[PDB]
Amino acid sequence: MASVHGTTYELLRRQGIDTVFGNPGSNELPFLKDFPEDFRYILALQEACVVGIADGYAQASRKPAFINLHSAAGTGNAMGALSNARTSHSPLIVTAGQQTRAMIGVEAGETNVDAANLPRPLVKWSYEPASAAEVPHAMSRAIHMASMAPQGPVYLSVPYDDWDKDADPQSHHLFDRHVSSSVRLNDQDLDILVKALNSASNPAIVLGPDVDAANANADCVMLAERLKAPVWVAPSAPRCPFPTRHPCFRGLMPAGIAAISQLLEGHDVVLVIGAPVFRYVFYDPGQYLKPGTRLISVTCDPLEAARAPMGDAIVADIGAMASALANLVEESSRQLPTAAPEPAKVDQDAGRLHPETVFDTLNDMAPENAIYLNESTSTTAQMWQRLNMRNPGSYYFCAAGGLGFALPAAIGVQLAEPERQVIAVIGDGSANYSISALWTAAQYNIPTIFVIMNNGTYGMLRWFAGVLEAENVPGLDVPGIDFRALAKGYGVQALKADNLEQLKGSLQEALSAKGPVLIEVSTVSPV
Amino acid sequence: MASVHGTTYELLRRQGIDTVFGNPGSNELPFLKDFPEDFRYILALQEACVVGIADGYAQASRKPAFINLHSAAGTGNAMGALSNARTSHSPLIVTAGQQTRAMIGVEAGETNVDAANLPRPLVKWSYEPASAAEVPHAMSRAIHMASMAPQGPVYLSVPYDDWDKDADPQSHHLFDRHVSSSVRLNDQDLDILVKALNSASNPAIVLGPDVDAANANADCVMLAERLKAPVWVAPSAPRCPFPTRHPCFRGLMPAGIAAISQLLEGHDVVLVIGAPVFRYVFYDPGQYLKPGTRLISVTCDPLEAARAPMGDAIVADIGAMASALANLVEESSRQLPTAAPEPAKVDQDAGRLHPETVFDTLNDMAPENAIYLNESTSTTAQMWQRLNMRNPGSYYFCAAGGLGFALPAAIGVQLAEPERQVIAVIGDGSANYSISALWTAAQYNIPTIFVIMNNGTYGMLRWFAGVLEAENVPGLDVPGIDFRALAKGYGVQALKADNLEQLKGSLQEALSAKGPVLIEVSTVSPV
Numbered sequence A, B: 001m002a003s004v005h006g007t008t009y010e011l012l013r014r015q016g017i018d019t020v021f022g023n024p025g026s027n028e029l030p031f032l033k034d035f036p037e038d039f040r041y042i043l044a045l046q047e048a049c050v051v052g053i054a055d056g057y058a059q060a061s062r063k064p065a066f067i068n069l070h071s072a073a074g075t076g077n078a079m080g081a082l083s084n085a086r087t088s089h090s091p092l093i094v095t096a097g098q099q100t101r102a103m104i105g106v107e108a109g110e111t112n113v114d115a116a117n118l119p120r121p122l123v124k125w126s127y128e129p130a131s132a133a134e135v136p137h138a139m140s141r142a143i144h145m146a147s148m149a150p151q152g153p154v155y156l157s158v159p160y161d162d163w164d165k166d167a168d169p170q171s172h173h174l175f176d177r178h179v180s181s182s183v184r185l186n187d188q189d190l191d192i193l194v195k196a197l198n199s200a201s202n203p204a205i206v207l208g209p210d211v212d213a214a215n216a217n218a219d220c221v222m223l224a225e226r227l228k229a230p231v232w233v234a235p236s237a238p239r240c241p242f243p244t245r246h247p248c249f250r251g252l253m254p255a256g257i258a259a260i261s262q263l264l265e266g267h268d269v270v271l272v273i274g275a276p277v278f279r280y281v282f283y284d285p286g287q288y289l290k291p292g293t294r295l296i297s298v299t300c301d302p303l304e305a306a307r308a309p310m311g312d313a314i315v316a317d318i319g320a321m322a323s324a325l326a327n328l329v330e331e332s333s334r335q336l337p338t339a340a341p342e343p344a345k346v347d348q349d350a351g352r353l354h355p356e357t358v359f360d361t362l363n364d365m366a367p368e369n370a371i372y373l374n375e376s377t378s379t380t381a382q383m384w385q386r387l388n389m390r391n392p393g394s395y396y397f398c399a400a401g402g403l404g405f406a407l408p409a410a411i412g413v414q415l416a417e418p419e420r421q422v423i424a425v426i427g428d429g430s431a432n433y434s435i436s437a438l439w440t441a442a443q444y445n446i447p448t449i450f451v452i453m454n455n456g457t458y459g460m461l462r463w464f465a466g467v468l469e470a471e472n473v474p475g476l477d478v479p480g481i482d483f484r485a486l487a488k489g490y491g492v493q494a495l496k497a498d499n500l501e502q503l504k505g506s507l508q509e510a511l512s513a514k515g516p517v518l519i520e521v522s523t524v525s526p527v
């Protein structure tokens, strides 16, 4: 307890941390030594995997996740993953070991040069302490910065000789600090907003990932029912904020300016909750909103409020605001929206699987409290239409579009939610980015199901190339990957589905298995 | 070529670039479209692999390598690899596609936020142009910044709508620009240095990676022979700068302060060429130099000159300086140094392989012009003692200690040197970091030999834990990886060696094979 090591672990446990996601190195050994018995360590083989797992775990648990990486090389390997963490507002405490203070100036091997600048601009806060005794206070800042709205990844670099040094005896005041950002709009202005919602003749609601992060899903259901309002999920959705077969639900918005203003045409008040306004992707110029539509955004993120090209904004906690609004608005006497029609069953022969067939089969066979992850980039629209997701925390997709998220994140989610079957639907291209994460699932017996959609190509990129009139583009096809052999390589049970009969058979086997299972599915291909 | 696209490819070809190492994304399609017939594209499945391959290629070819990655996520995935590239002074031109200019402010999906700050502090230059017409001039800056001493990675972010825009007609002046940093110390001061070397009673030479980068190896042989001086390789060596069985050669320096000053005791003048002074790693306090020893460093890098804790320094081109010194110093009439003794042949039974046995066997069987890569971290000393490397460009080791270098870099080196057999000796832990690079070797039929040293553990970390008296450390063992299955997964021929007879058999097969080959070697293990 007298040491920085002892004091830091005490701070961590008192702040509710009990798991370390890591890949170790020399600079981290003085931190990891005498690893306390009330903590667990989750090893992954590459740092993109470490951070991916921790990210899934944080998102599903709705609590900060603690990460330990090796210096610049380890931090650097994780920076694509940190890109995703930024956009999903994932509360990640990223720590990295630094060389001993005496060896920094000469730039010894393993020195993290100008360390705090390395993860910038992706992190909320980034720091290397000026002394050993400062380390617990620096850790306190990291914990709270990650945890306060808008939540996000933070970075702390610690010289390895710091851990053995005497702690400041006054560091005890850090242990039980409670910091809240659970705030909502003042009574007067909240009343004005509620009045505007009550007065709307044709309101619409758009929900984003911070709704699911806040577990505000049920309150948003109540709000939608009271306002009798259609509900969309904001484009490029990292999470699912609403039951997908509720009568109000209208699906995933296309990531385009004109496309969204068209969907919102005729709606006089559009209430956006917990979403950027908006995560557009494709070139689709036009009006941000059509005449007669006003927009009000509730966001936990000042930068989201600042960068919205239209509408009013309120910067507040999504949980507190959704609860306030759901409980304050009048019950409208308008007709409840009609449920969206069932998607068509596509023609399926005895050959390669249409993605539509895969999602239909999953929906038929998976438990109702399944959790899905998506990194099958060309099939996102079909997935959203065909999976009935009733419960919160049921969907995750790389928040910044960074591939290599879903495979490790599915392992972290499954760890956070041992009673809910996790099924990751991942493209053949996407599977390779963080392929080594499979080993963590096998070693810790984390029973994630991985469904590899093998069409031999970067399907989404072919679609983008068509849109952009981009001809003669190299590097779009990925033939000759045996995913069963890869799963075997990392100790994961592997199955193949070349047709529907095999798909049903493989899913049946996977859903009854005691460990992780990979199913390679032969899907229809433009190759 | 009226477009930015046409002008930029013309600049690239006129500057000698003909290969693009990449993993494509949406923002890169307008750059990659109409890919010119005089260029080749080398696809890798993850960006650490892309950069690793390009790095190996650049180091072996002694020319800049051109890289194309996807936005923040792709750049981020490659940042551990950029750490290595920084320390090896690798001339890498890293380009990344950005969102269209119109969609940056709203932060559309695939936007690289504050892009130029992302790869900092790892790169020597980092930039996003303010207009489309500036792109060729920005590319020109990138090419020359990467190429001038001290060589290093650079970063350029380009909004994807820039490529179709009209180029500045004055961009033609960029095409044939020749920029030289091939400089040496002025005559007067060079004369003073030569006189100091001539006057030394007991000189020693220490060489670093910039010697091999400069192909200054032969000049350093001449210098060592003229001075009759023992030659060491500077600690944490990324490259081999000297024939390892030349009588002057004294091997790899231990990465410690006291250890190095002890080796240099009695030497009145120590000439360091092309190395930092020094890449110490382990805690080993003492004198930087013992009384009676003075040090003179020749470095291509101002930061290396600035941060040396001792000695005089000259900042100049390594090729020009080695050539000048080798040709100006008098031939000493001192006795030529005695060659280092043979390493002992360790006892080897019919069971698991001692690393010593592996290197002895490789040295017996590999061609004299083989190129070795090292990422078997616990066996580095044994490797240096047991492999006779006569030629330049014969050795590569992760410059910043960042794992995941050797496997992809071995593919790049083999591409650069099709007539020299590349053999990568990689630990079981290290193999996973960039495992997907194997696919590139299979798809382009790049006949690299991968030797996996499988001891089931992070061996070097166990050693570090003993030095630091770090007990109860989690995450040090990596059981249950089948490397043959992994190689099969990516289409690479796979062999196993459980004993010496099998090792000899597997190496014989690998050396006669037409494609890439992985050999999993069961090595001796502390568990």
Ligand SMILES: Cc1ncc(C[n+]2csc(CCOP(=O)(O)OP(=O)(O)O)c2C)c(N)n1
Residues within 6 Å of the ligand: A080, A375, A376, A377, A378, A379, A401, A402, A403, A404, A426, A427, A428, A429, A430, A431, A433, A455, A457, A458, A459, A460, A461, B023, B024, B025, B026, B070, B073, B074, B077
């Ligand atoms: C780290 C990273 N690299 C590259 C990309 C660009 N990218 C976006 S979608 C895609 C295709 C993925 O292919 P696959 O997983 O097979 O799914 P499909 O598109 O075939 O459905 C690529 C390479 C990215 N978003 N992130």
Ligand SMILES: Cc1ncc(C[n+]2csc(CCOP(=O)(O)OP(=O)(O)O)c2C)c(N)n1
Residues within 6 Å of the ligand: A023, A024, A025, A026, A070, A073, A074, A077, B080, B375, B376, B377, B378, B379, B401, B402, B403, B404, B426, B427, B428, B429, B430, B431, B433, B455, B457, B458, B459, B460, B461
């Ligand atoms: C990207 C990265 N992650 C982690 C480390 C820390 N590290 C250094 S050596 C090592 C062990 C590598 O094990 P292996 O490849 O099996 O070789 P061995 O030590 O067993 O010879 C690790 C994890 C690093 N240098 N870089």
Ligand SMILES: [Mg+2]
Residues within 6 Å of the ligand: A427, A428, A429, A453, A454, A455, A456, A457, A458, A459
């Ligand atoms: Mg695909």
Ligand SMILES: [Mg+2]
Residues within 6 Å of the ligand: A117, A118, A119, A120, A121, B117, B118, B119, B120, B121
């Ligand atoms: Mg940075």
Ligand SMILES: [Mg+2]
Residues within 6 Å of the ligand: B427, B428, B429, B453, B454, B455, B456, B457, B458, B459
């Ligand atoms: Mg090992």
